[PDB]
Design a protein around this ligand. Structure first.
Ligand SMILES: [Mg+2]
Ligand SMILES: [Mg+2]
Ligand SMILES: [Mg+2]
Ligand SMILES: [Mg+2]
Ligand SMILES: [Mg+2]
Ligand SMILES: [Mg+2]
Ligand SMILES: [N+]
Lengths: 139, 138
């Protein structure tokens, strides 16, 4: 069991970010960002765009590094440890509608306003926001 | 292969940081930070303190997250991909001096002034500095 790298993406659209409820052994039914495992040789930005495309169909651009978090799930059915690298991005076409391209892993994607975020948030996301982190203004 | 997580540590002492020349198949003889592989279940801060202790004997405190870099070495004898999390720290005892605890991996550790850094820096470190990154003010 070793720590595994994931990239997670804050897609900023107006005052909103894209979230979707997980269908997963970890954080089931909680609202989370699009994202996934970093592949060998891939950059953070390449991973962000690929994962967003694979999961939502959305085309993003202007990717920027935000932060990194350490997320240990010792009590999961398969104990897991993720190191999650967060990336900010925007839509190439702000009118583009999300699709649920991996519908066995997510209930669906929707936009949520920064001042009216849904609950329950996936714990790594809630914990990060609890530190005061704001993807619109960070860095 | 798969990307592997390392934690690397900027130990700030006055205007200086700790660096040591690698003995390695990647970046041999270049100046690098103390650090190493994150273990399962470990926090970034726990890893930083453990790796610094194992490599230098130094006791550090006040750890703080700085940034993360993606470092691919496709050309290495064994192709490697590291995701490096940088941590800032200071010495518990400012008078403590490092020891070369793992001479198989490093020639030794010394303090280098921010305005007079040595060369060659290990490429991930040189590339990070090339972006304007400064561990004292970040
Ligand atoms: Mg994945
Ligand atoms: Mg994947
Ligand atoms: Mg995917
Ligand atoms: Mg190591
Ligand atoms: Mg090690
Ligand atoms: Mg060691
Ligand atoms: N995660």
């Amino acid at each position: 069991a070793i720590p595994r790298v994931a990239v997670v993406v804050f897609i900023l659209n107006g005052n909103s970010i894209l979230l979707g409820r997980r269908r997963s052994s970890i954080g089931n039914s909680t609202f989370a960002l699009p994202g996934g495992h970093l592949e060998f040789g891939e950059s953070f930005e390449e991973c962000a765009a690929r994962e967003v495309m694979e999961e939502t169909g959305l085309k993003i651009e202007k990717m920027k590094l935000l932060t990194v978090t350490n997320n240990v799930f010792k009590e999961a059915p398969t104990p897991s440890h993720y190191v999650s690298v967060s990336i900010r991005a925007v839509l190439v076409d702000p009118s583009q509608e999300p699709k649920n391209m991996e519908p066995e892993k997510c209930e669906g994607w929707d936009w949520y306003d920064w001042e009216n975020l849904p609950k329950p948030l996936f714990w790594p996301l809630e914990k990060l926001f609890g530190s005061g982190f704001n993807p619109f203004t960070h860095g």
